Amino acid sequence: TTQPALLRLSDHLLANYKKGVRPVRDWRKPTTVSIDVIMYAILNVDEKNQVLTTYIWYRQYWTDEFLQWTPEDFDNVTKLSIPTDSIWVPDILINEFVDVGKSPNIPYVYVHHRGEVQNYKPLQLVTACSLDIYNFPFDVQNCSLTFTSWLHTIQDINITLWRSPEEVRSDKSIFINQGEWELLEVFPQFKEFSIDISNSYAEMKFYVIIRRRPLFYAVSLLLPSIFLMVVDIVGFCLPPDSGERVSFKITLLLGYSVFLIIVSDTLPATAIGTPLIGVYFVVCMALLVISLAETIFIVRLVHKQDLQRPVPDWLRHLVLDRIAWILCLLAVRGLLQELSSIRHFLEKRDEMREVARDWLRVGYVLDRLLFRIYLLAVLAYSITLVTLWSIWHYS
Amino acid sequence: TTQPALLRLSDHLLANYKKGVRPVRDWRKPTTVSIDVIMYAILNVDEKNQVLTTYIWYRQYWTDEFLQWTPEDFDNVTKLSIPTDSIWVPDILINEFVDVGKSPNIPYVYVHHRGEVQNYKPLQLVTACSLDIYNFPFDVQNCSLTFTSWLHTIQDINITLWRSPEEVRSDKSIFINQGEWELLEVFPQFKEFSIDISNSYAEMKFYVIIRRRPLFYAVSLLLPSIFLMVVDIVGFCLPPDSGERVSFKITLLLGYSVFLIIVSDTLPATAIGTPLIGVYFVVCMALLVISLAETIFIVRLVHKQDLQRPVPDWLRHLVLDRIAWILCLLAVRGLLQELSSIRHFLEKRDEMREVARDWLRVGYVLDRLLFRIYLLAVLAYSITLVTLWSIWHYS
Amino acid sequence: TTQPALLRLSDHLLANYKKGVRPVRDWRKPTTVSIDVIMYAILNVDEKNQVLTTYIWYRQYWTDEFLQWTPEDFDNVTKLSIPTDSIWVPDILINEFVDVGKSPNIPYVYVHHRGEVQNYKPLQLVTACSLDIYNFPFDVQNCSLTFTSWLHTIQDINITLWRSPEEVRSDKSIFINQGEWELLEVFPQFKEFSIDISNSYAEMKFYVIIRRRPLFYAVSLLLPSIFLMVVDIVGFCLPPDSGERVSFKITLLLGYSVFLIIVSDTLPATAIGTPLIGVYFVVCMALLVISLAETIFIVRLVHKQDLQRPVPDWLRHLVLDRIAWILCLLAVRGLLQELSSIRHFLEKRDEMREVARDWLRVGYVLDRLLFRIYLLAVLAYSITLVTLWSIWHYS
Amino acid sequence: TTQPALLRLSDHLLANYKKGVRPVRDWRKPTTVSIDVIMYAILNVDEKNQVLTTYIWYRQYWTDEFLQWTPEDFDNVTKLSIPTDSIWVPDILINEFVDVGKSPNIPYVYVHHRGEVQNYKPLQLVTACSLDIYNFPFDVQNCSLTFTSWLHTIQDINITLWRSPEEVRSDKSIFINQGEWELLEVFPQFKEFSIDISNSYAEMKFYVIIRRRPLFYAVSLLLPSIFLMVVDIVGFCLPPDSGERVSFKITLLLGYSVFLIIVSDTLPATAIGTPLIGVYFVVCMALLVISLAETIFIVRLVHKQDLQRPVPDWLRHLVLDRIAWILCLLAVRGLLQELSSIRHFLEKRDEMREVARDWLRVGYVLDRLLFRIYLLAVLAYSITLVTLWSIWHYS
Amino acid sequence: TTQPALLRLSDHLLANYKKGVRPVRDWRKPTTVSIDVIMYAILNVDEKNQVLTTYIWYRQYWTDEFLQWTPEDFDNVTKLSIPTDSIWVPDILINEFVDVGKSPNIPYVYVHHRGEVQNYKPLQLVTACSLDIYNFPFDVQNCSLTFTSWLHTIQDINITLWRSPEEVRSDKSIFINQGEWELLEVFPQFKEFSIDISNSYAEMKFYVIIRRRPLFYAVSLLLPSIFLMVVDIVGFCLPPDSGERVSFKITLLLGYSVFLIIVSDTLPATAIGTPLIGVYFVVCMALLVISLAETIFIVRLVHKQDLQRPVPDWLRHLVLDRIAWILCLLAVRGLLQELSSIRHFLEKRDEMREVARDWLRVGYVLDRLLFRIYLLAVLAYSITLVTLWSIWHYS
Numbered sequence A, B, C, D, E: 001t002t003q004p005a006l007l008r009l010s011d012h013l014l015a016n017y018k019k020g021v022r023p024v025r026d027w028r029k030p031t032t033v034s035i036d037v038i039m040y041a042i043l044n045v046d047e048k049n050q051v052l053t054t055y056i057w058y059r060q061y062w063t064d065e066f067l068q069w070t071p072e073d074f075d076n077v078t079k080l081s082i083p084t085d086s087i088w089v090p091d092i093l094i095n096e097f098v099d100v101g102k103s104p105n106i107p108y109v110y111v112h113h114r115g116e117v118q119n120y121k122p123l124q125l126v127t128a129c130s131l132d133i134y135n136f137p138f139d140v141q142n143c144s145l146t147f148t149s150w151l152h153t154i155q156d157i158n159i160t161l162w163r164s165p166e167e168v169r170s171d172k173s174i175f176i177n178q179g180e181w182e183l184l185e186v187f188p189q190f191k192e193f194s195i196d197i198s199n200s201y202a203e204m205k206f207y208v209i210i211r212r213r214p215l216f217y218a219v220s221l222l223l224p225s226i227f228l229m230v231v232d233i234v235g236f237c238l239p240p241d242s243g244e245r246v247s248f249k250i251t252l253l254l255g256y257s258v259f260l261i262i263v264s265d266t267l268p269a270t271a272i273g274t275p276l277i278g279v280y281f282v283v284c285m286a287l288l289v290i291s292l293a294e295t296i297f298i299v300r301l302v303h304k305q306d307l308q309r310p311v312p313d314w315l316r317h318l319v320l321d322r323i324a325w326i327l328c329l330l331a332v333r334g335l336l337q338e339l340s341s342i343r344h345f346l347e348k349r350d351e352m353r354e355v356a357r358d359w360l361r362v363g364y365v366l367d368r369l370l371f372r373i374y375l376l377a378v379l380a381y382s383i384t385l386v387t388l389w390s391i392w393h394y395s
């Protein structure tokens, strides 16, 4: 024969090739497909829908017993490229699919002179994963991707690994960083699946373990809270009888309610329930309500409503004791009868204002004591909250 | 003949096979397709659009009378794989479709040596369902999926079940949990459908009964309400004549209105109307309006506007009776003529302030009585609201 | 010949069949297609985009003169199924398309022994419609769907109806209810269309008349309005000189503005303009502004600013007349010289407070009169608003 | 020969037809395609993305030199229908594409007996346009659609017009109105395009000029502004020393800020910058700030802080002049020594209150003058704003 | 032979052409593809998803050794058009793909008489890019697009440039401006890629450098801030003892909080953290908190709570020194015994009011000093903020 080019080899491979039959000379021998995957980027994590969208570079190889030739008599050709849609291709899919991703089509494969067939392709995966958000800013997710043949049983198609699992799990080569998620590892494991007894299938499960970067949410959830706490603290400097303390506190409570309502949408709460962030927000709500109740009580105490005399049973241990326990602080007759009324009226006015002064002093002492108690409680809460981050970070 | 491989069997099956003709030797015998379905995950429930999106694993089998062979003379081959697009396939669809889902294509099927043809595929279903949200947090939905042939009548295609309905309905093997919906059951039923008389079709209806998990909405709808109720309760501690009580109440009402407006979007209301949650919110609105009206009335009562003498007809039964019914509490002439004016002015001032004091006492008594009544009403409402959850949960 | 099966009939129909030529023996005879449609569900009505999305079950039939056979010599076969993509199919589309819907493909059709060819398919339609929202909660929409051949003129393809128009228009058999829209009717009409003179086409127009259910918007637009009206009414019980009336009214106005802004997005306003709901909201705005202006005027009137004596020309007809027209309500010299100053100062203080009391009484009378007038106006407006719904509902 | 039907003509046209070669007998003659377009509906105008989405009905014709036949010997057939995918079709596209629209496929074309080939199809176009929003409510947009062959140069494919440009530009026959946009005209123009010297292409540019209907935004941007202006005007009726004027003004400013923030999203601002609507809103902001500053100044002026005597240098020209310039308005000794203190104290109290009264009168005069000035300024601004609309509308 | 037309040339090129084999006569010679790209429009920059969407016009050429002919004997034809799907086409893709864009298909290519094959097509690219937003309004982005063959190694396919890199980088000919992004340059670079040792591929990387236009965000982030600053400045004109200063300040703080919450969504914060805009906003928060604290302190100082005598140790250096350091400002006995009480009461009232006056003067002096200090600090901050823009712009 002549030597036109290598294309006649293709003819010798595809003159009478049937692409609908599994390529084995003995039907009792299963076709083994060796696969591996490299993660490229974590595209999306929908917590409320429990959906994970990722991108991978996937490659696989198997053996075709009808595509073998001698390199001699073909100008020492050892491998070539063949269109994908002209040979048998296994139907390897992922169990966890909930949608069909958009990925480009690769129309060529390699064939070697010993039946070695290799296939490279990129895949966009939209899978269903169970996400635990119990500790939302510092959660670690552990999803799974299970590769298996949808139809063929283990007697026809078996799945192995292209390379060792040790180098598969420690592989971060093309991964895209600074994208709110950090790829920890990808651990492979082989299994034999069977719902109903009579049919058994080969499955290769890749456990993808990833970790969230908390610094994205470290300023959107912390600074407004401490700002509202510090303005609450500075609000106590107003005197209780000024009259605008109650308006200040109710305005602050309204602002905090608006904040929590407008922020709770961005923090998902699914599965077992809300994360501990909701618990801490509820604690802040309780603290604000306690402060408002103390303000209401002291305003009620220092109010002027034609009060009675101050009670001695709550004066000896409230002014004297608290000073040391805590920080310290014929015509004549007509003239006299006329002037007696003026004198009596001025006396009763003076008595009323003296009673008001005593009640004001009692209220001031109580306000100072409650301010000190609230300040100590706030400091203790801040310390016991920051110690958790301190012990978590040093790990 | 020689023995190249099993592929010649495929040739013997596909040399002169026509895929456009229904595979029966006698045209009077219908082709029976036995199907079954396993639910995988509930993807979405759009209440306002009345749309249900689910994922299922579907499989079916039928008999092809032109794909039969003897296992002998073919190296004892009992079954093989054939491309799907080379044989006749029934057109089984779902009546309730409103859109086309994205599902992967399976290019292979099994064929056994007796004409047995089996087909496995995953399906994403976007169907139309009637959703009842009368009891929104605890609703149970009952949707239907009807499998039928779109064209062929019962004289051509008939539908049966692969396995017993008892094991079909009690099947939760691959279902994905912690996704806001719990799969209760899937009940199958066969029916003969016919709009117009002359044409009758076979239908297999699967009733999918699912239940919503209420704990997702148990913290987003309850804690703010009780928080606003408790701050309303603590707001009554302010004296009526302080002046900031009205501002406090109107600010609280504005906050509650903002809350209800910003939350009502997340609670759908369709079909028959709003759920009972709207009724309970309206009840809370009425309670808040009653509290505001009581505050306005008492502020009007205790106001100083140069009032008249206190009425005896509303004093004997308001102070004395309420104490026991409810909880208890030549130059001379010129000098006299001059001083008489001062005495009279001080007398009239004292009379005015005494009248004001009496009115203030009456207002305080009324405020205490209304506070007790409102507290009892709130307690009764809370008890009669929690008893419904108590009786519902223990079931 | 032998009798393998009916499939040879298919061969006899498809041995030398050309699917690119119109199936008529005489080219002067047009091909008549008889069609009909059953609505299934109204999917979406985008008012701002003027788009209607619906789902229909469509079927059609025509005559193929190259697909005729004798039932004898073919085992008395009268009809069979043929793949759709192997025969000629008319290009019937809808003029009003603005997008391509996603509908499943039906790969089979019936053929009878006289050339009768029937085709069933479901269609998702996304069309452009002119929507009138002049009376938004009670609007009735009248859209059109025009079926016609895109290329062939009336000399090639003509369109008729499968069944009588009377049974077409009175057909609600598979329609999905409780979906915010009620299907009133579907009226068909035939027409001959022609933009430019030389080309005339056959068109079949289905007028789809549907009606909106108002109860969906009967609680989202009515209860907050009446709630704000009733709190406005109860706000008048505050005395004009209390000082928090103005703050109450401005807070109520701010809340109403927030409500209208946050609700106007959900009410579309397109085409000719806003519905009458905007007019009624503007009327409510005017009423609230009138109430605020009355409050401002009365507060200005009852204020203490060292006023002059009360005017007699606005006292005789303001207190006396209004009572019946409306509801009723050597050293000596030094001592005298010294005491004269005190007497004069007390006299001028008493005169000032008497003037203030008179002005307060005038303000109270005016406030009562304006309150009665506003209450009557509100009652009249409510009656004349509810009478429209009363006369509309009983129809 | 016999006379089966016209289909043999199709055979005579498609026995040895090659659809991959340009249909010319001489390769030096370009293939001329005559096209035209009718707009159907303006679907979307994304200003921030600078994207225009439209729907058109497009048709074209050219000459195929291998599809000619004699009407005689073919039963006087002059034209017929041929599948689109069996003949050569030019690749005419639009330069401005940024996405692929979804349009139905038309599988048939006409062929006449002289090689005339005509093609009708609907097209959904998603193109990139430069939008100028300098005058946002009354802007006129001028977009372009350029039809050209993507590959073939002017030596192969040339583009002309099916009909005269005069009847093309004055064509509003199927356009959908009441959709926020009015189609003004569609002007065609031919051009020869060439980036790099060696290659020249034929282009047909259609300038689509459209106009926005302002009445859609005439109620969403005007009524709230005039409402806030009129409530600002009525807010001046409060006396300066009442105390709630400042709260009223700050609440109004907060409401206006909320309005502008919640509305500015719906008004896009791209390219050269914000439209004049932002300038007018800034003017309203400046007016409100001026009003607030005047209120703050007058409240500071009329406040009681133990002031000094009123200044004569700012009293002669402030009360007297403004009235005409603007609108007008042994024991004895002890007794005397004792009473002298009371007399002196009452004298100093009277002096203080007289000083306060004088300052209050000065503040009232200044408040009236500033109110008149602000009213005149508001009237002038309203007139000079409405005159622009008056002169624009009458054009 | 005869001369029908040029189409026989196509036959001579496609009689026995195999499109699945790489077109080289010697398999050891790689196929070189020369490519180039012209950017058309920047479609989208998703910062939170780190996604870049662009549109390009791409063209490439290579050599096909089986598509060569002599121009003579073919009527001097030098080049022609061939369908794309009938010849070998290299699989050149982009590494950074995360999705599949929608671009039109071009069904024709040129072939010259020396095997020259050219291919033109438009491409919509959705790629993953690392975006740095450290200086958000003035950021410059530097993305990469890497063209390479997905399967073939450098022994089969090699990539070069169609034209010189100098004219590639300085090419802005069809780019669409006024779209929030300015194209700075496109720099090409060749590289040899290899993850694992044994396989090496050719890559052509285009670095696309673009710049954001800040004027889009120059009015949405600056004018409200300066407006709130100027109203804060004018709020200091209120006297400290007026009573509405605290309400004014808390309302302003609530408005600023609402502004920052409603604006922070439109400013993304990803990767390394928030831009300096957040730092400047935090600085504004600190300034507002300082102003509020000063107001609270001065209101506490000037309040009347039955204070003690003014302290001399904080009066000599607070009134005298500050004036120069800063800007300046038997029966008888009964009658005497009776009148002594009145005299003493008036004396103590006068002493109390004198003490209040002294404290008010001290508070006024402190308020003026703090106002001057705050004004100077605000001016310094404004100058040191505007100097950065001044030095950045002149570059």
Ligand SMILES: O=C1c2cccc3[nH]nc(c23)CCN1[C@@H]1CN2CCC1CC2
Residues within 6 Å of the ligand: A095, A148, A149, A150, A151, A193, A195, A196, A201, B036, B037, B038, B057, B058, B059, B120, B121
């Ligand atoms: O589809 C079904 C399935 C559906 C409906 C009923 C079923 N019974 N038993 C099974 C099955 C077997 C499970 N799979 C899958 C098919 N391949 C891919 C994943 C599963 C295992 C192998």
Ligand SMILES: O=C1c2cccc3[nH]nc(c23)CCN1[C@@H]1CN2CCC1CC2
Residues within 6 Å of the ligand: B095, B148, B149, B150, B151, B193, B195, B196, B201, C036, C037, C038, C057, C058, C059, C120, C121
């Ligand atoms: O499409 C139609 C249909 C359309 C338009 C008019 C019609 N009259 N009678 C019918 C029908 C029969 C009902 N189906 C369906 C076709 N298969 C799937 C579901 C239905 C029953 C069998």
Ligand SMILES: O=C1c2cccc3[nH]nc(c23)CCN1[C@@H]1CN2CCC1CC2
Residues within 6 Å of the ligand: A036, A037, A038, A057, A058, A059, A120, A121, E095, E148, E149, E150, E151, E193, E195, E196, E201
């Ligand atoms: O797909 C893989 C790939 C996947 C899974 C495992 C892998 N090991 N080594 C590689 C690879 C080689 C890298 N590419 C790509 C294939 N072409 C386009 C881009 C890369 C280089 C050449």
